[PDB]
Each structure stands twice: as structure tokens, then as C-alpha cells.
Coordinates of C-alpha atoms in Angstrom, one line a residue:
Chain J
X3 CA 20.4 26.4 14.7
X4 CA 17.6 23.8 15.1
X5 CA 15.7 24.3 18.4
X6 CA 12.8 21.9 17.6
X7 CA 12.0 18.7 15.8
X8 CA 8.7 17.8 14.1
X9 CA 8.1 14.0 13.7
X10 CA 5.6 12.1 11.6
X11 CA 4.0 9.3 13.6
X12 CA 3.1 6.2 11.6
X13 CA 6.1 4.7 9.8
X14 CA 8.6 7.2 11.3
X15 CA 8.6 6.5 15.0
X16 CA 6.0 3.7 15.1
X17 CA 6.1 0.5 13.1
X18 CA 2.9 -0.2 11.2
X19 CA 4.0 -3.7 10.3
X20 CA 1.9 -5.1 13.2
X21 CA -1.3 -4.2 11.3
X22 CA -0.3 -6.8 8.6
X23 CA -0.6 -9.5 11.3
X24 CA -4.0 -8.4 12.7
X25 CA -5.2 -8.4 9.0
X26 CA -4.0 -11.9 8.4
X27 CA -5.7 -13.1 11.6
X28 CA -9.0 -11.6 10.3
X29 CA -8.5 -12.9 6.7
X30 CA -5.9 -15.8 6.9
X31 CA -3.4 -15.6 4.1
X32 CA -4.7 -12.2 2.9
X33 CA -2.9 -10.0 5.4
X34 CA -0.1 -8.5 3.4
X35 CA -2.4 -8.0 0.4
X36 CA -5.1 -6.3 2.4
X37 CA -2.6 -4.0 4.3
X38 CA -0.8 -2.9 1.1
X39 CA -4.0 -1.8 -0.5
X40 CA -5.5 -0.3 2.7
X41 CA -2.4 1.8 3.3
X42 CA -2.4 3.0 -0.3
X43 CA -6.1 4.0 -0.4
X44 CA -5.7 5.9 2.9
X45 CA -3.0 8.0 1.2
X46 CA -4.9 8.6 -2.0
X47 CA -8.1 9.5 -0.1
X48 CA -6.3 12.1 2.0
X49 CA -4.8 13.7 -1.1
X50 CA -7.9 13.5 -3.3
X51 CA -10.3 14.8 -0.6
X52 CA -7.9 17.7 -0.1
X53 CA -7.8 18.6 -3.8
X54 CA -11.7 18.4 -4.0
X55 CA -12.0 20.3 -0.7
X56 CA -14.1 17.5 0.7
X57 CA -12.4 16.9 4.1
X58 CA -13.3 14.1 6.5
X59 CA -11.2 13.1 9.5
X60 CA -8.5 10.4 9.3
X61 CA -10.7 7.9 11.2
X62 CA -13.3 8.3 8.5
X63 CA -10.7 8.1 5.7
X64 CA -9.3 5.0 7.2
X65 CA -12.7 3.2 7.4
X66 CA -13.5 4.3 3.8
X67 CA -10.2 3.0 2.6
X68 CA -10.7 -0.4 4.4
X69 CA -14.3 -0.7 3.1
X70 CA -12.9 -0.1 -0.5
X71 CA -10.1 -2.7 0.0
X72 CA -12.5 -5.3 1.1
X73 CA -15.0 -4.7 -1.7
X74 CA -12.1 -4.7 -4.1
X75 CA -10.7 -8.0 -2.9
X76 CA -14.1 -9.7 -2.5
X77 CA -13.7 -10.1 1.3
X78 CA -16.8 -9.9 3.5
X79 CA -16.1 -7.2 6.2
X80 CA -18.6 -7.0 9.0
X81 CA -18.7 -4.0 11.5
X82 CA -16.9 -5.9 14.3
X83 CA -13.8 -6.8 12.2
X84 CA -13.9 -3.3 10.8
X85 CA -13.5 -1.7 14.2
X86 CA -10.9 -4.3 15.3
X87 CA -8.6 -3.7 12.3
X88 CA -9.0 0.1 12.6
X89 CA -8.1 -0.2 16.3
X90 CA -4.8 -1.8 15.3
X91 CA -3.3 1.7 14.8
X92 CA -3.7 2.6 18.5
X93 CA -1.5 -0.3 19.6
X94 CA 1.6 0.1 17.4
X95 CA 5.1 -0.5 18.8
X96 CA 7.9 2.0 18.3
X97 CA 11.1 1.1 16.3
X98 CA 13.8 -0.3 18.6
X99 CA 16.0 2.9 18.6
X100 CA 13.1 5.3 19.1
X101 CA 12.7 5.3 22.9
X102 CA 16.4 5.9 23.7
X103 CA 16.8 8.3 20.8
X104 CA 13.9 10.4 22.0
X105 CA 15.3 10.5 25.6
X106 CA 18.7 11.7 24.3
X107 CA 17.2 14.4 22.1
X108 CA 15.1 15.8 24.9
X109 CA 18.1 15.7 27.2
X110 CA 19.7 18.1 24.6
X111 CA 17.0 20.7 25.3
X112 CA 15.2 20.3 22.0
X113 CA 11.5 20.9 21.7
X114 CA 9.9 17.7 20.2
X115 CA 6.6 17.6 18.4
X116 CA 4.6 15.0 16.5
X117 CA 2.5 16.1 13.5
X118 CA 0.3 13.3 12.3
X119 CA -3.1 12.7 10.6
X120 CA -5.1 11.1 13.5
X121 CA -6.9 12.9 16.3
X122 CA -4.9 14.2 19.2
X123 CA -6.6 11.6 21.3
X124 CA -5.5 8.7 19.0
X125 CA -1.9 10.1 18.7
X126 CA -1.9 10.3 22.5
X127 CA -3.1 6.7 22.9
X128 CA -0.3 5.4 20.7
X129 CA 2.5 7.4 22.5
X130 CA 1.1 6.8 26.0
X131 CA 0.7 3.1 25.3
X132 CA 4.4 3.0 24.5
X133 CA 5.2 5.0 27.6
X134 CA 6.7 7.8 25.5
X135 CA 4.0 10.5 26.2
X136 CA 6.3 12.5 28.5
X137 CA 8.8 12.9 25.7
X138 CA 6.8 15.3 23.5
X139 CA 6.1 19.1 23.9
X140 CA 3.3 18.9 21.3
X141 CA 1.0 16.3 19.8
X142 CA -0.4 17.8 16.6
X143 CA -3.2 16.7 14.2
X144 CA -4.0 18.1 10.8
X145 CA -7.6 18.2 11.8
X146 CA -7.7 21.9 12.9
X147 CA -6.8 23.0 9.3
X148 CA -9.3 20.6 7.6
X149 CA -6.8 19.6 4.9
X150 CA -3.9 17.0 4.6
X151 CA -0.2 17.1 3.7
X152 CA 1.4 18.2 1.5
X153 CA -0.9 21.3 1.7
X154 CA 1.2 24.1 3.2
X155 CA -1.5 25.0 5.7
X156 CA -0.5 21.8 7.5
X157 CA 3.2 22.7 7.8
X158 CA 2.4 26.2 9.0
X159 CA 0.6 24.5 11.9
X160 CA 3.8 22.9 13.2
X161 CA 5.6 26.3 12.8
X162 CA 2.9 28.0 14.9
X163 CA 2.5 25.3 17.5
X164 CA 6.2 25.1 18.2
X165 CA 6.7 28.9 18.3
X166 CA 9.8 28.8 16.1
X167 CA 10.6 29.9 12.5
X168 CA 10.6 27.0 10.1
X169 CA 14.4 27.3 9.6
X170 CA 14.9 26.3 13.2
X171 CA 12.6 23.2 13.1
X172 CA 13.9 19.9 11.8
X173 CA 11.3 18.1 9.9
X174 CA 11.7 14.3 10.2
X175 CA 9.7 12.0 8.0
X176 CA 9.9 8.5 6.5
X177 CA 7.7 9.4 3.5
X178 CA 9.7 10.9 0.7
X179 CA 6.6 12.7 -0.7
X180 CA 6.1 14.3 2.7
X181 CA 9.8 15.3 3.0
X182 CA 9.4 16.9 -0.4
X183 CA 6.5 19.0 0.8
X184 CA 8.4 20.1 4.0
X185 CA 11.4 21.0 1.9
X186 CA 9.5 23.3 -0.4
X187 CA 7.9 24.8 2.6
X188 CA 11.2 25.8 4.2
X189 CA 11.9 23.2 6.9
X190 CA 15.4 21.7 7.1
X191 CA 14.4 18.1 6.2
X192 CA 15.6 14.8 7.4
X193 CA 14.4 11.7 5.5
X194 CA 14.4 8.4 7.5
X195 CA 15.1 5.7 4.9
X196 CA 15.4 2.4 6.7
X197 CA 14.7 0.0 3.8
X198 CA 16.6 1.3 0.8
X199 CA 13.9 3.3 -0.9
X200 CA 14.7 6.0 -3.5
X201 CA 13.6 9.6 -3.1
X202 CA 10.6 11.0 -5.0
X203 CA 11.2 12.7 -8.3
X204 CA 9.4 16.0 -7.5
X205 CA 12.3 18.4 -7.7
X206 CA 13.6 18.1 -4.1
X207 CA 16.2 16.2 -2.1
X208 CA 16.3 16.0 1.7
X209 CA 19.0 17.8 3.7
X210 CA 19.8 14.5 5.4
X211 CA 19.0 10.9 4.6
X212 CA 19.5 8.6 7.5
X213 CA 18.8 4.9 8.2
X214 CA 17.3 5.5 11.7
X215 CA 16.8 7.9 14.6
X216 CA 20.3 7.0 15.8
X217 CA 21.8 9.2 13.1
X218 CA 19.5 12.0 14.1
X219 CA 20.8 12.0 17.7
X220 CA 24.4 12.1 16.2
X221 CA 23.5 15.3 14.4
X222 CA 23.4 17.2 17.6
Chain P
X3 CA -31.0 17.8 -21.2
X4 CA -27.4 17.0 -22.1
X5 CA -26.1 19.0 -25.0
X6 CA -22.4 18.2 -24.6
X7 CA -20.0 15.4 -23.5
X8 CA -16.6 15.8 -21.9
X9 CA -14.3 12.7 -22.4
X10 CA -11.1 11.8 -20.6
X11 CA -8.5 10.6 -23.1
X12 CA -6.1 7.9 -21.8
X13 CA -8.0 4.8 -20.6
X14 CA -11.4 6.1 -21.6
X15 CA -11.3 6.4 -25.4
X16 CA -7.7 5.2 -25.9
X17 CA -6.2 2.0 -24.7
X18 CA -2.9 2.5 -22.8
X19 CA -2.1 -1.3 -22.8
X20 CA 0.2 -0.8 -25.8
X21 CA 2.7 1.0 -23.5
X22 CA 3.2 -2.3 -21.6
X23 CA 4.5 -3.8 -24.8
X24 CA 6.9 -1.0 -25.7
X25 CA 8.1 -1.2 -22.1
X26 CA 8.8 -5.0 -22.4
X27 CA 10.7 -4.4 -25.6
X28 CA 13.0 -1.9 -23.8
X29 CA 13.3 -4.1 -20.7
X30 CA 12.3 -7.7 -21.7
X31 CA 10.2 -9.4 -19.0
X32 CA 9.9 -6.1 -17.0
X33 CA 7.2 -4.5 -19.1
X34 CA 4.1 -5.0 -16.9
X35 CA 6.0 -4.2 -13.8
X36 CA 7.4 -1.0 -15.2
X37 CA 4.1 0.2 -16.6
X38 CA 2.2 -0.4 -13.4
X39 CA 4.5 1.7 -11.4
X40 CA 5.0 4.3 -14.1
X41 CA 1.2 4.9 -14.3
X42 CA 0.9 5.1 -10.5
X43 CA 3.7 7.6 -10.1
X44 CA 2.3 9.8 -12.9
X45 CA -1.0 10.0 -11.0
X46 CA 0.6 10.6 -7.6
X47 CA 2.9 13.3 -9.0
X48 CA -0.1 15.2 -10.5
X49 CA -2.0 15.2 -7.2
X50 CA 1.0 15.9 -5.0
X51 CA 2.4 18.8 -7.2
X52 CA -1.1 20.3 -7.2
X53 CA -1.4 20.2 -3.4
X54 CA 2.1 21.7 -3.0
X55 CA 1.3 24.3 -5.8
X56 CA 4.4 23.1 -7.7
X57 CA 3.0 22.7 -11.2
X58 CA 4.9 21.3 -14.1
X59 CA 3.3 20.0 -17.3
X60 CA 2.3 16.4 -17.9
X61 CA 5.3 15.7 -20.2
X62 CA 7.5 16.7 -17.3
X63 CA 5.5 14.7 -14.8
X64 CA 5.6 11.7 -17.1
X65 CA 9.5 11.8 -17.4
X66 CA 9.9 12.3 -13.7
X67 CA 7.6 9.4 -13.0
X68 CA 9.6 7.1 -15.4
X69 CA 12.9 8.3 -14.0
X70 CA 11.7 7.3 -10.6
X71 CA 10.3 3.9 -11.7
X72 CA 13.6 3.1 -13.3
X73 CA 15.7 4.1 -10.2
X74 CA 13.3 2.1 -8.1
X75 CA 13.6 -1.0 -10.1
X76 CA 17.3 -0.8 -10.7
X77 CA 16.9 -0.5 -14.5
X78 CA 19.4 1.6 -16.4
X79 CA 17.4 4.2 -18.4
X80 CA 19.3 6.2 -21.0
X81 CA 17.9 9.3 -22.7
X82 CA 17.0 7.5 -25.9
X83 CA 14.9 4.9 -24.3
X84 CA 13.4 7.6 -22.1
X85 CA 12.1 9.5 -25.1
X86 CA 10.9 6.4 -26.9
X87 CA 8.8 5.1 -24.0
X88 CA 7.4 8.6 -23.4
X89 CA 6.4 8.8 -27.1
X90 CA 4.4 5.6 -26.7
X91 CA 1.5 7.8 -25.5
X92 CA 1.2 9.6 -28.9
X93 CA 0.5 6.3 -30.7
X94 CA -2.3 4.8 -28.7
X95 CA -5.1 2.9 -30.4
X96 CA -8.8 3.5 -29.5
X97 CA -11.0 0.9 -28.0
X98 CA -12.9 -1.0 -30.7
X99 CA -16.3 0.6 -30.0
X100 CA -14.9 4.1 -29.8
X101 CA -14.8 5.2 -33.5
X102 CA -18.3 4.1 -34.4
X103 CA -19.7 5.4 -31.1
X104 CA -18.2 8.8 -31.6
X105 CA -19.7 9.0 -35.1
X106 CA -23.1 8.2 -33.7
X107 CA -22.9 10.7 -30.9
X108 CA -21.9 13.5 -33.3
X109 CA -24.7 12.5 -35.6
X110 CA -27.1 13.3 -32.7
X111 CA -25.9 16.9 -32.6
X112 CA -24.0 16.6 -29.4
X113 CA -20.9 18.8 -28.7
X114 CA -18.0 16.5 -28.0
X115 CA -14.9 17.6 -26.0
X116 CA -11.8 15.9 -24.6
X117 CA -10.4 17.1 -21.3
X118 CA -7.0 15.5 -20.7
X119 CA -3.6 16.2 -19.0
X120 CA -1.3 16.4 -22.0
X121 CA -0.6 19.4 -24.2
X122 CA -3.2 20.2 -26.9
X123 CA -0.6 19.2 -29.4
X124 CA -0.1 15.8 -27.9
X125 CA -3.9 15.2 -27.5
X126 CA -4.2 16.2 -31.2
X127 CA -1.5 13.8 -32.3
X128 CA -3.3 10.9 -30.6
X129 CA -6.8 11.7 -32.0
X130 CA -5.4 12.6 -35.5
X131 CA -3.3 9.5 -35.6
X132 CA -6.5 7.4 -35.2
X133 CA -8.3 9.6 -37.7
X134 CA -10.8 10.7 -35.1
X135 CA -9.7 14.4 -35.0
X136 CA -12.8 15.6 -37.0
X137 CA -15.0 14.2 -34.3
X138 CA -14.3 16.7 -31.5
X139 CA -15.4 20.3 -31.0
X140 CA -12.8 20.9 -28.4
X141 CA -9.5 19.4 -27.3
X142 CA -8.7 20.7 -23.8
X143 CA -5.6 20.4 -21.6
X144 CA -5.4 21.2 -17.9
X145 CA -2.3 23.3 -18.6
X146 CA -4.0 26.7 -18.9
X147 CA -5.1 26.4 -15.2
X148 CA -1.7 25.1 -13.9
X149 CA -3.3 22.5 -11.7
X150 CA -4.6 18.9 -12.2
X151 CA -7.8 17.1 -11.4
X152 CA -9.7 16.7 -9.1
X153 CA -9.1 20.4 -8.5
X154 CA -12.3 22.2 -9.5
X155 CA -10.5 24.8 -11.6
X156 CA -10.0 22.0 -14.1
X157 CA -13.7 21.1 -14.3
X158 CA -14.7 24.8 -14.7
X159 CA -12.5 24.8 -17.8
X160 CA -14.7 22.2 -19.6
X161 CA -17.8 24.2 -18.6
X162 CA -16.3 27.4 -20.0
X163 CA -14.8 25.9 -23.2
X164 CA -18.1 24.1 -24.1
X165 CA -20.3 27.1 -23.4
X166 CA -22.9 25.1 -21.4
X167 CA -23.8 24.9 -17.8
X168 CA -22.4 21.8 -16.0
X169 CA -25.8 20.3 -15.7
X170 CA -26.0 19.9 -19.5
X171 CA -22.6 18.4 -19.9
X172 CA -22.1 14.6 -19.5
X173 CA -18.7 13.8 -17.9
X174 CA -17.4 10.5 -19.1
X175 CA -14.4 8.9 -17.3
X176 CA -12.8 5.5 -16.7
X177 CA -11.2 6.7 -13.5
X178 CA -13.5 6.4 -10.5
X179 CA -11.6 9.1 -8.5
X180 CA -12.1 11.5 -11.5
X181 CA -15.8 10.6 -11.7
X182 CA -16.0 11.4 -8.0
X183 CA -14.5 14.9 -8.6
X184 CA -16.8 15.6 -11.5
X185 CA -19.9 14.5 -9.5
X186 CA -19.0 16.8 -6.6
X187 CA -18.5 19.6 -9.1
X188 CA -22.0 19.2 -10.7
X189 CA -21.5 17.3 -13.9
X190 CA -24.0 14.4 -14.6
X191 CA -21.4 11.6 -14.5
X192 CA -20.9 8.4 -16.5
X193 CA -18.3 5.9 -15.2
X194 CA -16.9 3.6 -17.9
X195 CA -16.1 0.4 -16.0
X196 CA -14.9 -2.2 -18.6
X197 CA -13.0 -4.5 -16.3
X198 CA -15.1 -5.0 -13.1
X199 CA -13.6 -2.4 -10.8
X200 CA -15.4 -1.1 -7.8
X201 CA -16.1 2.6 -7.3
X202 CA -14.0 4.8 -4.9
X203 CA -15.2 5.2 -1.4
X204 CA -15.1 9.0 -1.3
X205 CA -18.8 9.7 -0.8
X206 CA -20.0 9.6 -4.4
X207 CA -21.6 7.3 -6.9
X208 CA -21.8 8.0 -10.7
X209 CA -25.1 8.6 -12.4
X210 CA -24.4 5.8 -14.9
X211 CA -22.0 2.9 -14.8
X212 CA -21.5 1.4 -18.2
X213 CA -19.1 -1.2 -19.7
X214 CA -18.3 0.7 -22.8
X215 CA -19.1 3.6 -25.1
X216 CA -21.9 1.5 -26.6
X217 CA -24.0 2.1 -23.6
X218 CA -23.4 5.8 -23.8
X219 CA -24.8 5.9 -27.4
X220 CA -27.9 4.1 -26.2
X221 CA -28.5 6.8 -23.6
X222 CA -29.5 9.2 -26.3

């Protein structure tokens, strides 16, 4: 039934925990605090700007979210440190099972795509850096539609880019709010729950809840 | 210039801190923790459901958000406690300056309106309970437009209900993300910052930043 798979990038295939460390190096002892807030503001800003119809790209939203975090915590953030922390996203490392799992999925003749927030160039840098670039048929950004998830215009992009009806595309995401959007859209959804989180209470439940990509491979 | 004022309810005119206590009584020692998460999920659910075009009223969103908080914390939440905590919002107390400030503003011939998320009946209960019901020309809910702020359809409601152009309506809100939306819409905006928060980094700045309603009265 499923002929393609759409993956979220940050937090699903690639571990963002490394940013915590780069944050702690910039502001010793503050790392975890800074990252938690930074991540949250990035999210809120994508949702809020979408609702207001005031789109700016993810790099912009990321800087704005860091600028806020720093003002909010009282930290002095110069331009240099700003760029350096923001660059931490281009050097993420994949989760242990990811590489082998991707190889196996491709060997099964499945079309694999990534649908993320960053530019196609940034998405490319992360996957290429990990040597996984050859494993994807498509590297998609929300940028062309000028809106963020869970706006349906974003999900239609994956459907179009992959050339398959939504019912034949497996949507794989770590974020429960994202899995909720995809489910309402029509994608058979797989929620990757590695750390014991509970699903969002927005009227949906994923088709599959797995602890890693290993369980995805075993679905085929 | 300004002939009317649109006020947000929870957190602007009425103190929600009382919910913390009712939460701690239900789950001793957990109060602050439960409330912080509950408040955050209410917000996220209003934004997310709007983006997905999956509207449910605020009472619903509030229950869903509490149900999630409880599952997330491991707390056992029965129906009774659910209703009781949810009812805590109908018995809020206004901030000290609020009553006198409202009296003074009305004495100046200004049209006063409240634009909140809850039903007109719930909004009425809170204001009536505090004996402030006679102080408002309009008690507005987002319900008629089936979407939440910062969606512009919500702001147009206030403009229509008050019978004034947006340029003549002062938008007063405690939430910086809300003040940002109103500003992009066209309302001269007053941000009530009582506890030293910093403004959101979404490209806007309020026209006035005050520490309480006392400074609002002094504007006229």
C-alpha cells in the first residue's frame, strides 16, 4: 500500500541534543535552559506567523527566537555567537539506527522524502554532512508555500513532490502535534516516540507509535 | 482619537493565579506545575486547531489541555476534579486597580469591550461575579468566527461589534503575541506588562507598554 515515506528532519532522523552543548559552551551552565526556550519560541513563532500571515523563513524565525531567549534570560548575545549557535543545526548527528534503517528502506524500493522547515540548502548540508544524501529522493522545505505546519498547504506539498496519493505515503514524525496534522490531512501516520511522551489531545491518534526507525523497517 | 477600548479577559483584567491554588488543593504540591503546563497547552491547542481548521470551543480546548497535562504528569484525573478545576476560571478576581480604572474610563465616555476566548455566558459569569458587568458595552467571544487569535477574523469582530474603525479602538492585552497580532491588524496597541516580561520578536512593538490599568486611565 505505502510506496513512499515522508520524514521530518530535526528530532526524527537527526538528534538536536548537540545544540544544548554548543549553547552551554557559549553560556556555561545556561545551555539546557537556553535550548529549551529557544526550541519553544521557534515553534511558537512558526505557528503564530502563519496565523497572522506574516511569513519569514526558518533561518529568520530561528534568529528571532534566539534573540528573544537571550533578552528573556538577560544574556548578552553578540552577532558572532548568534551565527555560531544558529550554525549548530547544520552539523547535527543522526540517531544510531537511522543510517542502517534508511539503507534498508531504500533497498525495499520505497521513495523516501524529507519535509522540513529549513531551506533545501540547509537540509542538504545536514544530510550530506552525515553521508546520507544519496538516501533521499526528495529534500523538501515549507518555504515554497510561505506557511508552516500544521497548515494543510504544507502537507499537499509532500503529496505533490512524491507523485503519490496521500494514502500511499507514510508520514513519520517525532512531534505529536505534527502527526496530528498529518492524520487529519489523510496520511497514514507513524509517531516516533523514543522518550515516553504522551500524544496530543487534539482528537487524533497515530496509526503506529514506535520507539525508533527500527520498528519502521519491520513494518515492511 | 480613541473612542473605544477592547480588553482581553484572562490575565489582563482578571488574575488567573487563583487557579494555581485550586490545582494544588486537588494535587497537593503539584499546583504550580499543573497550571503552568495546562495554560501552555490551552494556548498551543487554540493555535494548532486554528491552523488545521479543526475548531472546538474554548471549554473543550480547556478540558483537552487539562486531560493532556494530567496524562503527561502521571496524575489520576477523575471527572469531578476535571469539572471543578475547569470551573476555577468562572470565579477569578480582578487585579486591584481594575475596578476603579474601569469606572474612570467609562466616566470619560469611552466604549468598553472585552474580546476573550470563552463563551459569552462564561465571560459574563466572571465579570458579573466581580460586580463589573455594568462596565462593559460588549462582551465578545471568538466563537462566532470559529477560529482563535491571532487570526485576523477575530480582530475584525471587535471592529464590527464596536462600530468604530480599528484606528479609533485601543487594543489592550497582557499577551505580547496577542499585542503583536493586533498591531499588524491596525489597532493602536497597549501592552500591559506587570511582571517585567520582554516583547515577542515577531517584528512588532506596542504603541504603549504600561505596568497596569492605572497608566491607561492617565492616557485620556
